[PDB]
């Protein structure tokens, strides 16, 4: 600590006084991981390995809930031509928890895939499938030419070429109403400057790379704003109390000391907040008990030193710290320990005889180097 004061003051000589040095902070004893004991895996075989997808004008929307995800099977699959996320990293998906998950499944031409991304425009993004500017989620696609292409052209997949106005994010319009591009009104099936609104893709095995059919699944899930229904493949650990721990309760990551709380959460409630609108209590997601959350002790470290021209002996004040914490941080010899109202004072001898103040410690206490 004397070399720490010389370092902090940028000087090889230090005058008699009390100087601030790197803050004391009690470290996690162990981690805690808690999630509900759900087992069944999500419908990723029925979403990504389905026999066929719908046309882009009638894109399918499947709900994924009450299941465990395994995104290493999907991301590591060589069949996927792109697996690109816009509000999460693909490697974080297995280390992450999901509120609501929706799979949007449809087929488009590889040249049109460029319009599926958030913030885009053009006939696909404008008339059949738009993502929001701040889209959080992942776009997954693979070449399906062997599955969905025919030598004369598999025209069974359609898009929307005509529409009265542009559509909003995640709007789906299946309607086949005839569109009038000219100012003159029309009736029946077709006429001058009057068009059928949908158009078929020219899906042929002779098409160049980009002109071939790609199957697209877009995961448009939401994070950290509602009760979770899809989750990472994490095993729940044992739960401990009366110790400083790195806890995680259904994604509630933090470091603190857990204790049994008297806060009466209502049947619909799971997390408890303080006047500052921050979490101060949590109900365990598997065992229905409420734990009071308080972070570990920490504060500045003050070094008390006579002059360098006097002595190399120094004393250390752990500000805002209960003495209990010192042996926990196994000066650990002690036999000079004393709890002051400023914090835990170590390396200094407590003397009952009152003297005039020399080096100020705080809360009525002062130190000095004496015989």
């Amino acid at each position: 600590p004397l070399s720490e004061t010389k370092c902090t003051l940028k000087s090889f000589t230090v005058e008699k006084g009390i100087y601030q040095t790197s803050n004391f902070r009690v470290q996690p004893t162990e981690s805690i991981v808690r999630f509900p004991n759900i087992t069944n895996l999500c419908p990723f075989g029925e979403v990504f390995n389905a026999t066929r997808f719908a046309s882009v004008y009638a894109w399918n929307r499947k709900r994924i809930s009450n299941c465990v995800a395994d995104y290493s099977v999907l991301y590591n699959s060589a069949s996927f031509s792109t697996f690109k996320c816009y509000g999460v990293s693909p490697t974080k998906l297995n280390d992450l928890c999901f509120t609501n998950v929706y799979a949007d499944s449809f087929v488009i031409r590889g040249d049109e895939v460029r319009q599926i991304a958030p913030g885009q425009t053009g006939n696909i993004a404008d008339y059949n499938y738009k993502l929001p500017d701040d889209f959080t989620g992942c776009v997954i696609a693979w070449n399906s030419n062997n599955l969905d292409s025919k030598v004369g052209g598999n025209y069974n997949y359609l898009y929307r070429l005509f529409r009265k106005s542009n559509l909003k994010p995640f709007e789906r319009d299946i309607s086949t109403e005839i569109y009038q591009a000219g100012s003159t009104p029309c009736n029946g099936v077709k006429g001058f400057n009057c068009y059928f609104p949908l158009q078929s893709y020219g899906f042929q095995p002779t098409y160049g790379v980009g002109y071939q059919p790609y199957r697209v699944v877009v995961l448009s899930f939401e994070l950290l704003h509602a009760p979770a229904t899809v989750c990472g493949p994490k095993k729940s650990t044992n739960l401990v109390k009366n110790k400083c721990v790195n806890f995680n309760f259904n994604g509630l990551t933090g470091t603190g000391v857990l204790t049994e709380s008297n806060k009466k959460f209502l049947p619909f409630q799971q997390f408890g907040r303080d006047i500052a609108d921050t979490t101060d209590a949590v109900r365990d997601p598997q065992t229905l008990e409420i734990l009071d959350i308080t972070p570990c002790s920490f504060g500045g470290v003050s070094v008390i030193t006579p002059g360098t021209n006097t002595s190399n002996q120094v004393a250390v004040l752990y500000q805002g710290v209960n003495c209990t914490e010192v042996p926990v941080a196994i000066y650990s010899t002690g036999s000079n320990v004393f709890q002051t109202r400023a914090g835990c004072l170590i390396g200094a001898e407590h003397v009952n005889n009152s003297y005039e103040c020399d080096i100020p410690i705080g809360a009525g206490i002062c130190a000095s180097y004496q015989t």
Binding site: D274, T294, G299, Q319, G320, A342, C357, G362, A363, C366
Partner: peptide, 26 residues
């Protein structure tokens, strides 16, 4: 005539003259 403050890195230091020491000078 506090807990959240210390929990967010805010530390309040005690005065050198306590509420009795200030009253003793008075």
């Amino acid at each position: 005539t506090i807990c959240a403050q210390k929990f967010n890195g805010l530390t309040v230091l005690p005065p050198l003259l306590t509420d009795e020491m200030i009253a003793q000078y008075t």
